[PDB]
């Protein structure tokens, strides 16, 4: 044929070079994300930074609202993120007409995975580099987190993290859930759910971040919303109201 | 798309792929055609070494292209079916449309034309076959003998020989034919054809297959019995010229 990394075909070893390099250096773009599940919400915190004072940070987007209710958190670069967004959006909409029902996280995950795989076998396309975390509060499962990753592999989570502070986030939640004997915390108001998230975040990444350095996306039953800049400071001050 | 290159120039103004097509023919079996002025004889090898072949369903080297026209070859059988099929269709196409029996020149142009296409056109390679095409034009008693190469070129020849040891059989034939006095009788032109093809088959008198074409669809394949007789005779001739 050609070679195993000038076109996409098996390696000597049965590996795929392109999928493993797609895992690595697409999360080192100054991005770190976590998603945790509420009681009647789903919270995402994700880093999101602007290096100029001349770059309007509103257009800067890496939590997208796929539908009115669906969110998708992308870890990886904006050229890739919009190829996956266009696909996601289209899939969401199509689903809504044809099957008469709102798009579940899991179905979207599964569909996108199989598609990426096909593009992985192709000798004139690449797998996208992006890692896609699809969030809502389904009325067919409660709060949900389902994540696809780039190899055509995808799997459901109850809480997930990405970027190399994966270990830190996990351990804090694991110990906590083993003690309380639940993997979802119980609290109604979204506000208290974001405070729970921050607590585990601050400890784990070992830092706190500004309003414009964060972006927080909240899933609720039949809405997904992003928190304004003042709204993200309100929460950071509110734990410090306690202190 | 697989209309892209698969046949490229040489720097010498040949084509690599046509030079390599001719080699397969040489390794191959030998076919010959020798002309009288009443017939055209075609000899074809059937050198069965092994005795476990059943030879009524072991492929022949003689095809009808038309009822008054034959094609013989030396080269890969697999490729030759593909050419043989397109050439039968073309005889019937003329017959249908012109209301006329087929003329030898046009068929030769056709055989030449498919091979010529596949060198010129991309994502195809030429056939592994050289052919001899012979027959008689309608209402005509003079012999016709054409040679085509998988280059796609074409020529007429009074006699021509192809495949393995082409040199040896040309060289011999050249001493036993003149255009000014070619043979009138079937027996002596056949004697000459069997004698050339003896000298390269090694042992053969059932391994040599003669088919003699007289004007307009009198096409008759001589048998082993008959051939063994000419070989005896040739062994008598070679101690009358000692």
């Amino acid at each position: 044929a050609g070679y195993d990394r000038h076109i996409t075909i098996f390696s000597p070893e049965g590996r795929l070079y392109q999928v493993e390099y797609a895992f690595k250096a697409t999360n080192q773009t100054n991005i770190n994300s976590l998603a945790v599940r509420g009681k009647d919400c789903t919270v995402v915190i994700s880093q999101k930074k602007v290096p100029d004072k001349l770059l309007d940070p509103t257009t800067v987007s890496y939590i997208f609202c796929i539908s009115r209710t669906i969110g998708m958190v992308v870890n990886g670069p904006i050229p890739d993120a919009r190829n996956a967004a266009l696909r996601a959006k289209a899939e969401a909409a199509e689903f809504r007409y044809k099957y008469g029902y709102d798009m579940p996280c899991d179905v979207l995950a599964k569909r996108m995975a199989n598609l990426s795989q096909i593009y992985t076998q192709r000798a004139y396309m690449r797998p996208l580099g992006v890692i896609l975390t699809f969030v809502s509060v389904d009325e067919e499962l409660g709060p949900s987190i389902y994540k696809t990753d780039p190899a055509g592999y995808y799997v459901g989570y109850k809480a997930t993290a990405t970027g190399p502070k994966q270990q830190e986030i996990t351990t804090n939640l694991e110990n906590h859930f083993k003690k309380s004997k639940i993997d979802h915390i119980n609290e109604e108001s979204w506000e208290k759910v974001v405070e729970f998230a921050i607590t585990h975040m601050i400890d784990a990444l070992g830092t706190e971040f500004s309003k414009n350095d964060l972006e927080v996306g909240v899933a609720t039953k039949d809405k997904f919303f992003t928190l304004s800049a003042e709204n993200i400071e309100e929460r950071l001050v509110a734990i410090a109201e306690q202190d | 798309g697989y209309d892209r290159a698969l046949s490229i120039f040489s720097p010498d103004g040949h084509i690599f792929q046509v030079e390599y097509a001719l080699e397969a023919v040489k390794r191959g079996t030998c076919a010959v055609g020798v002309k009288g002025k009443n017939c055209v004889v075609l000899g074809c090898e059937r050198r069965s070494t092994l005795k476990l072949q059943d030879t009524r369903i072991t492929p022949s080297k003689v095809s009808k292209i038309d009822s008054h026209v034959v094609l013989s070859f030396s080269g890969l059988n697999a490729d030759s079916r593909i050419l043989i099929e397109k050439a039968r269709v073309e005889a019937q196409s003329h017959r249908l449309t012109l209301e006329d029996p087929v003329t030898v020149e046009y068929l030769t142009r056709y055989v030449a034309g498919v091979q010529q296409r596949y060198t010129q056109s991309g994502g195809v390679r030429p056939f592994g076959v050289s052919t001899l095409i012979a027959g008689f034009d309608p209402r005509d008693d003079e012999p016709k003998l054409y040679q085509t190469e998988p280059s796609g070129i074409y020529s007429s020849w009074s006699a021509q020989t192809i495949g393995r040891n082409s040199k040896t059989v040309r060289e011999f034939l050249e001493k036993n034919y003149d255009r000014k006095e070619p043979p009138a009788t079937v027996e002596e032109c056949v004697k000459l054809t069997v004698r050339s093809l003896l000298e390269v088959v090694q042992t053969g008198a059932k391994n040599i297959e003669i088919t003699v074409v007289k004007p307009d669809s009198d096409i008759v394949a001589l048998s082993s019995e008959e051939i063994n007789q000419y070989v005896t005779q040739i062994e008598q001739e070679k101690q009358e010229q000692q």
Partner: protein, 243 residues
Amino acid sequence: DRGVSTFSPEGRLFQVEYSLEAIKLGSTAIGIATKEGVVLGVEKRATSPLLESDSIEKIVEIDRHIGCAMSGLTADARSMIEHARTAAVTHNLYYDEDINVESLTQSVCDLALRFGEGASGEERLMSRPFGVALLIAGHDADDGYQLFHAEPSGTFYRYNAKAIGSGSEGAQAELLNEWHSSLTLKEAELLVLKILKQVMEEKLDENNAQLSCITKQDGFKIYDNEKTAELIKELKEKEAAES
């Protein structure tokens, strides 16, 4: 294999250069256009008793006013003829009259451009360019007698005389000295025979040469074996009496 779009630092394509190499290996074709005709002559060559030498010729008729003699690969000149007949026939039906020899060369040269992988400008269906160059000779009622040299590269020039083939370097040089602007059809044919004799390593017979002519009361006319030989018979004696 070899690029189909890759040029030399000068900017002359590899494929074009390679086209020029096959041309130089055929047997000479020589044309002189005069004021009463166009003469096209070829060396057919080969004489054998196992060869039918007067059944093969290199001067083929396109139309009742157009011939071509070739030099180079002969198999290639069959595709060029198939395109050329179709184009001329369709124009005679639409406007009832002769097609121009320059016009024909351009229509053919357009399909000489395909080779290789396709373009988005053009669908390239072939694999190599044509390895034969041609002298196309004709008559039209609006420029009289003419002679044209088509190169497979794309360039076509009108000439009053031109030689192509292996032995063209010598041949052309002779053409100029012999050429003048009161040259006639009958002289030109005799002269052709002189040139052909000179450059042969053999005796000139009509089973190694063929003549042809154009007169406008008969169109493109092949000077037959019987007439060509009578002309050869007359040559040998007259030359062999200047010594």
